Amino acid sequence: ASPFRLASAGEISEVQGILRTAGLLGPEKRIAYLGVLDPARGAGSEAEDRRFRVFIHDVSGARPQEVTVSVTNGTVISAVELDTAATGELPVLEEEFEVVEQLLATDERWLKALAARNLDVSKVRVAPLSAGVFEYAEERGRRILRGLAFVQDFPEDSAWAHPVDGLVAYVDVVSKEVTRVIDTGVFPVPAEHGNYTDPELTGPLRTTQKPISITQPEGPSFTVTGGNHIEWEKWSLDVGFDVREGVVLHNIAFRDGDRLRPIINRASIAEMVVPYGDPSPIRSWQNYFDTGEYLVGQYANSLELGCDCLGDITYLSPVISDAFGNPREIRNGICMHEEDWGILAKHSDLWSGINYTRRNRRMVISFFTTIGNYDYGFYWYLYLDGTIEFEAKATGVVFTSAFPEGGSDNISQLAPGLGAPFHQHIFSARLDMAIDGFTNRVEEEDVVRQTMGPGNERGNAFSRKRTVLTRESEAVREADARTGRTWIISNPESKNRLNEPVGYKLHAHNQPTLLADPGSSIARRAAFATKDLWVTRYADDERYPTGDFVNQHSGGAGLPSYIAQDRDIDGQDIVVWHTFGLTHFPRVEDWPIMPVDTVGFKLRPEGFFDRSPVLDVPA
Amino acid sequence: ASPFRLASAGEISEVQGILRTAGLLGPEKRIAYLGVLDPARGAGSEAEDRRFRVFIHDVSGARPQEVTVSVTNGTVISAVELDTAATGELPVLEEEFEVVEQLLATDERWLKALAARNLDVSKVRVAPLSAGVFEYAEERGRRILRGLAFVQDFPEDSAWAHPVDGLVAYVDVVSKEVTRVIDTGVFPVPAEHGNYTDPELTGPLRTTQKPISITQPEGPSFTVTGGNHIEWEKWSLDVGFDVREGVVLHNIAFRDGDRLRPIINRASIAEMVVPYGDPSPIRSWQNYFDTGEYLVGQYANSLELGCDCLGDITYLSPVISDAFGNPREIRNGICMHEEDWGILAKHSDLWSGINYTRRNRRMVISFFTTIGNYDYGFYWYLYLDGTIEFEAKATGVVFTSAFPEGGSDNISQLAPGLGAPFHQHIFSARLDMAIDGFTNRVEEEDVVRQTMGPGNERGNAFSRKRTVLTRESEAVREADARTGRTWIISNPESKNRLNEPVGYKLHAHNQPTLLADPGSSIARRAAFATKDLWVTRYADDERYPTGDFVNQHSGGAGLPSYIAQDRDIDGQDIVVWHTFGLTHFPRVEDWPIMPVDTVGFKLRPEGFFDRSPVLDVPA
Ligand SMILES: [Cu+2]
Ligand SMILES: [Cu+2]
Ligand code: NA
Ligand code: NA
């Protein structure tokens, strides 16, 4: 059993049948989102009712629906009609990716724009880009995708090298009308290729790297039971998978002697946004919610042994729905392994003569996804000493434009005539805290400087302070790297042996948050991304910092709406949302394919244990 | 042949023989410091004379001396008497460590303080602690160590568990006088032991950890020639070792096509200080410059295969002088290895159908040192993509105190009665830059937010600005994490194919800098630690941010004196000094032996290459 087990191919086919028989899955319907619902609070005495939540899109434009289905009983529990002009459009479907390019290929404004630039339509790729919400009054209630063009010179060519600037199209994918074709001027299409597998670009391959062999003679130290339940060096957890969020960790706990102590109830990356900083109207509207608009889990890669994942790997192969409700297995979509992590603790003592050295290790659960030109690896780490860590790895090909003659304040030049507009990748981690159980609170810790004076006559003293966040209206926080600011999640009703409330300290990377003007559409639609830390009271339906239907929604859904409830968070069931991101001014070294850059955060035990928890590690 | 070769055992004897011949190294003399001198500029082309610099301590108190000698010519190049009362005492000798406990063991005042607490003198360890510069007029012209006591109940007991608070003693280690014994009250000596190899505290050791086997069947991809010259995956450099700074990197360069391109001429950790923030008179004077006062290189551990350095390791065994001028080999004091570093670049393309993955690696050069309760690992990494990184790893046992009844604002409780005063560990990296050669300049790069308005009507635009630091007076910089501030070192006379100055970008961790009041003794003596970044014009004698003689030296030397000369740094031979540190509020988890915490920095190529430099890495 386990009410936390991964969705099976059978459950997904059951959802399909159930929907099909209740009349909700006609020829014109598409599954836009499908995932398992988590167990409600309490509810632990009751046997599984496996439920699935489903967004049904209608290609004719009739109303979409949100449907909840019980798989154990074979019934629709509810179906609600969606007013998308109110609550937002449905996520972008894989099959809609093509539709932008095909619709445009017969539009005469588009054909004429290509003809002016001497581009063969059969060689012109169109990226299917989400819309946002700007000043275009005809777009309200229309399902829109925007289109930017890239030239592919041949089947295996990297079209990203050949952007067609000065030209953008807006397209109603439902009515199949091109609503606008905006041409602001021809710009040369950058000429050089970006084919990073072409010997002409690689030059001769290095023969100098000798193999590194990583093996585990006696197998790994972790177990997997029930399909997805891990135990490893005192840690216990379940590894979930959602087509929108990707890997999601459930019931993170740590064995302290006799007791299994809970730390985090659910951890996920609940949204991520890529806002572009170029004020040209070709691009000034682009802001991709890869998570909320495109759904990152659906494009999770199959990870190749010795290539994506090196060493003794245990795979999970999550199953998702396609657009028709058929199960699709993502084979080896999640890697799980343990690795050596250097020195954990070391001391050679001058008085005892004892020399002591122990090594560290971490458990790694990861996947890797691809959304158009980006690729992102999501990695969770658990260490021996109780630390939890997340890390995002951003690679792929940068999104390109022309580089204007006489330069730019908003774009980098990567190759002759080729630009890469400035942008950010900003993630939100939603951490439903359970530090020794659900009664938690958050404190903001600052370092406190002290003035030389009485009490401090040498002027060496320094201290720190902690401020409990008591209500949601005062739980919207910014980083302050100058005063070493962190946030402690404690349990005021579980004390360690020194009679202090047990806790975990969140260490942020303190990177810039959203740069856009606060009056922008993006600052409203991705308000989560303007502050580094938010604390909300737990509620079942408060899932994403951006709300449930991100595509084309007007603003303030999600975290600003939740926080407006101004609920008690002081010693309550609470959820922490940490914003963290990369601000990317691309470099020549990022072209034609980019070296991984990274960002993340970590949580460390802060008086959680009664002493170091790693004294029982052997040499 | 190598002008950058490590010191040999012969070279060291040679210096002792030359000093002996000169009448400089009689029986009352000690070598407090000895290292090889780096070639002067335009040299190896002017001369190639092999030279050594020595600080000679005199155990009778006559003035010490600084002496430069040529080991090839067998001559003294210069010798100067040191007025230690003005320019600073010499580094503390390993052989002075026991002197403090020894002199106190027969002092009536110390014996009376111990009696009052019911402590057997034979059981009481005293830590030999640097003295700094405070308000004690009898200290002028005296070589002082201060002492703090810890009880050791048996030969293998960790005495750190048993601090004897309320008591401190000052000792003139040359005249063998105890100058003061301060007793502010009896404090219970904390009772629990902290013996981390004791099964009482360990519990049964885990049997769950399976082995991880890391091997290189065909050997490592790097070569080592000339004893310390490394070449690895396009990188080239020389690994030096100095008794004060530890491992030092020379001539870091990167082969780009048919040129060896310099990046960094010399890299080192040129100081690191541990200031304490407890206002108790027992501790308010403590600030240990483990580099400048104690010499971290001295205490470099012999590193054991498996255990300290895992995988296929090539060791160096640098050679240092003893206090008598005899060579002493630090067997296996430096580990060098390469290691797999996860994904380098990855992309699955929706149009070309090509899936591409490359793995990263890094070359690691490290040592690990022990200073008292103290252990630090210094790690330099070079990545395949051009990135250079430093990491410091801090572990050991925390410096303890009593925990006062009624709590503390400057001290954490670790065990019943057992305190750990708040302190920082702050490092200074001295980076003698050579970006494509010596003509370098530094630019401070801030993100620029833009106001919604004409030219940015949607309010999405963001940019950045870069400010050339032209003169030393302008080049004392602070971090600003909110505006994502970094510093670019570029060569205005060396342009990439896009006609931009080639450069490297420094990414700092933006941790708190020195917290002490700006009027404190420590703020002046560790002035480098109060700012994140400084830039100086290269000068042979400008070596340490704290000057040559740190022990009992007031402010007046080092980085603020260098800066005052206000030299041109815009397209010149320049040196970057980067302050970074950990602010340590100890936690229960740190006791009785602390898990590694880390801090560091990195430099990444910024338009240095003409495209990615890792397109030639094999699958
Ligand atoms: Cu980017
Ligand atoms: Cu510390
Ligand atoms: Na919670
Ligand atoms: Na230089």
Residue numbers in the entry:
A (entry chain A), B (entry chain B): 9 to 627
Quoted from the paper:
Copper amine oxidases (EC 1.4.3.6) (CAOs) catalyze the oxidative deamination of primary amines to their corresponding aldehydes with the concomitant production of hydrogen peroxide and ammonia. AGAO is a homodimer comprised of two subunits, each of which consists of 638 amino acid residues and has a molecular weight of about 70 kDa.
The reaction proceeded within the crystals when AGAO crystals were soaked in a PEA solution and freeze-trapped in liquid nitrogen. The reaction stage of each crystal was confirmed by single-crystal microspectrometry, before X-ray diffraction measurements were made of four reaction intermediates. Based on the spectra of the crystals with deconvoluted absorptions, we found that the wavelength of the maximum absorption spectrum of the crystal soaked in PEA for 2 min was close to 352 nm, consistent with that of TPQssb. Two peaks, 436 and 466 nm, arose with the passage of time; peaks at 60 min, similar to 120 min, were 436 and 466 nm, which were consistent with those of TPQsq. These results suggested that AGAO in crystals reacted with PEA during the time course from 2 to 60 min. We concluded that the product Schiff-base (TPQpsb) was formed as a result of fitting models for TPQssb and TPQpsb to the electron density map. We also found conformational changes of the amino acid residues in the active site, Phe105, and Leu358′ of a neighboring subunit that moved as a cap for the substrate channel. In this study the rate of the catalytic reaction of AGAO in crystals was 6.0 × 104 times slower than that in solution.
